[PDB]
Amino acid sequence: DDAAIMPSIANKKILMGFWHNWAAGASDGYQQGQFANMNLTDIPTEYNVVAVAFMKGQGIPTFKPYNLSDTEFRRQVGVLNSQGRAVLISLGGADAHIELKTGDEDKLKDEIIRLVEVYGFDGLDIDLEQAAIGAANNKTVLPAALKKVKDHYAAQGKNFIISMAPEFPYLRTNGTYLDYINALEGYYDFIAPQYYNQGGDGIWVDELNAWITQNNDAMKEDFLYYLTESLVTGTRGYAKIPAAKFVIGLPSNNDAAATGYVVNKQAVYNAFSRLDAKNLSIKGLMTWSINWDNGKSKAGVAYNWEFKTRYAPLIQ
Numbered sequence: 001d002d003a004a005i006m007p008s009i010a011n012k013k014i015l016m017g018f019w020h021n022w023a024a025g026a027s028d029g030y031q032q033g034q035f036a037n038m039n040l041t042d043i044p045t046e047y048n049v050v051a052v053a054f055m056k057g058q059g060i061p062t063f064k065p066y067n068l069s070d071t072e073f074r075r076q077v078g079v080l081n082s083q084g085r086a087v088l089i090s091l092g093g094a095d096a097h098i099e100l101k102t103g104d105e106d107k108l109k110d111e112i113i114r115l116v117e118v119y120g121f122d123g124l125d126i127d128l129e130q131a132a133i134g135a136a137n138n139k140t141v142l143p144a145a146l147k148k149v150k151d152h153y154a155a156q157g158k159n160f161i162i163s164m165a166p167e168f169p170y171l172r173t174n175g176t177y178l179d180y181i182n183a184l185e186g187y188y189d190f191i192a193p194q195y196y197n198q199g200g201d202g203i204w205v206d207e208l209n210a211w212i213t214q215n216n217d218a219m220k221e222d223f224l225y226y227l228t229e230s231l232v233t234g235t236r237g238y239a240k241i242p243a244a245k246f247v248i249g250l251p252s253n254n255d256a257a258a259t260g261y262v263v264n265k266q267a268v269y270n271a272f273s274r275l276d277a278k279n280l281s282i283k284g285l286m287t288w289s290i291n292w293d294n295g296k297s298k299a300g301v302a303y304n305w306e307f308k309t310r311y312a313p314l315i316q
């Protein structure tokens with residue numbers, strides 16, 4: 001039963017991407033482009049962590065493939081798992097109506113385990129929208145349910161992966177989101193903050209006497225390096241996340257996010273080598289999204305896996 005395997009992502013860097021569980025409209029992109037619809041088995045093998053978007057819903061959130069039978073979806077997850085590639089279910093996204101109630105910890109654990117058994121998922125990504133981070137009892141019920149799920153699979157010899165994809169400004173000192181990170185200390189495998197869609201947010205870098213915003217293309221390398229350094233050291237107004245458990249999240253192209261797209265690939269290569277030189281090597285890259293990475297612009301130009309082609313060599 002290949003889908004039953006939970007691939008290990010230890011001892012290597014990852015190239016993680018999100019896969020959309022809904023059909024493309026005519027112009028969903030931030031520049032009116034269109035994303036590609038595809039099977040999981042159409043995803044380039046270089047994407048070794050695929051996060052399925054999204055588990056959502058009032059009461060106990062859930063997930064069902066929008067266009068594949070459960071059997072066929074599990075078969076495809078099994079193909080990826082046979083290749084050593086992990087497939088996570090991502091809880092959240094826009095308009096998810098996630099409002100967990102105290103007392104629903106075991107019901108949420110049971111539904112996560114059901115999704116693993118039905119679809120072959122290897123873990124869960126937390127991608128809550130801003131309205132959900134402090135909603136209802138999400139703060140306590142979600143970490144409690146996940147610890148139970150992790151413990152359940154660890155008893156079977158399996159590592160159920162837990163990841164989080166916070167907007168980067170969620171991670172400043174005294175941030176309400178830090179409660180999730182602290183509650184899951186020793187349970188989460190990595191945190192992949194979104195270095196996009198917050199164009200006006202920035203950091204003051206004394207080393208350059210410069211204010212660098214997330215929408216500054218001229219200084220993109222320094223934005224990637226210094227926001228990462230701040231996050232993995234707990235400086236410049238940010239709380240600390242261990243570098244070995246840290247992943248930089250980027251838009252695959254300008255249709256995938258309003259701002260944040262890295263125009264010059266060398267900015268990423270250099271940010272990584274600079275972190276490596278300071279013994280701050282990180283876990284890899286995440287992108288929104290795989291469907292966008294093979295989509296097309298408004299003018300019909302194919303993105304043709306630009307993100308995967310630019311950065312897979314860095315990861316492997």
Ligand SMILES: [Ca+2]
Pocket residue numbers: 002003004005006007077081120121122
């Ligand atoms: Ca699996």
